[PDB]
């Protein structure tokens, strides 16, 4: 034979998934969202009352 032709290199874009994670803790934690620009980098603290005894 000796088909001393032209050699290329192929790259296929069928990715190989390797990582698969789950976040049960963060799904179970309740997400609260202050409105728009409610608090800035300087003051972002909030005080919430505690049920009275």
């Amino acid at each position: 034979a000796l088909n001393e032709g032209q050699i290329v290199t192929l790259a296929v874009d069928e990715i190989i998934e390797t990582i698969s994670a789950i976040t049960p803790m963060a799904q179970k934690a309740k997400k609260y969202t202050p409105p728009a620009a409610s608090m800035q980098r300087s003051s972002n603290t909030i005080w919430m009352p505690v049920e009275q005894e």
Partner: protein, 45 residues
């Protein structure tokens, strides 16, 4: 490839596309219905 993946990809595209209009509209509804003083950083200091 996952059906949920495709659905959530479309939903994320739309959600991030219509973001600022939605937040302005929510602000307008709150301003017109609940209170004109959304000054919540103060009002507590």
């Amino acid at each position: 490839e996952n059906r949920l993946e495709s659905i959530l990809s479309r939903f994320d595209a739309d959600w991030t596309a219509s973001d600022e209009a939605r937040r302005e509209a929510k602000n307008d509804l709150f301003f017109s219905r609940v209170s004109q003083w959304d000054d919540w950083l103060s009002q507590y200091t």
